[PDB]
Amino acid sequence: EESSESALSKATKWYLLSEIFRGLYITLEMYFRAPYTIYYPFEKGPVSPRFRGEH
């Protein structure tokens, strides 16, 4: 009896999957972003002068 939301508001979010449709929408935002992948062996990740490799 101390829930601020009315019964219909709590059930409209529940039946219409409020947060799931948002969750899909955020994932779809990434679809229109630049990916991170680099095309090794045609490109190389960063190296620094302190790097340890072959002796």
Partner 1 sequence: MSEVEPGWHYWLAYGTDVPPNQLKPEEKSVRAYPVKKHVPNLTYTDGAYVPYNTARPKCATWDPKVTERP
Ligand X SMILES: CCCCCCCCCCCCCCCCCC(=O)OC[C@H](COP(=O)(O)OCCN)OC(=O)CCCCCCCCCCCCCCCCC
Shortest distance (Å) from residue 37 CB to partner 1? 16
Which CB atom, from 15 or from 51, has the smaller least distance to ligand PLC? 15
Instruction: Quote the DSSP letter at residue 33.
Output: S
Residue partners of 19: CB distance under 8 A and separation at least 6: 13
For residue 4, the minimal CB distance to ligand X (Å) is: 7
**Does 31 contact ligand PLC by CB under 6 A?**
no
The option from partner 1, ligand PLC, ligand X, none interacting with 8 (CB < 5 to 8 A, set by class) reads ligand X
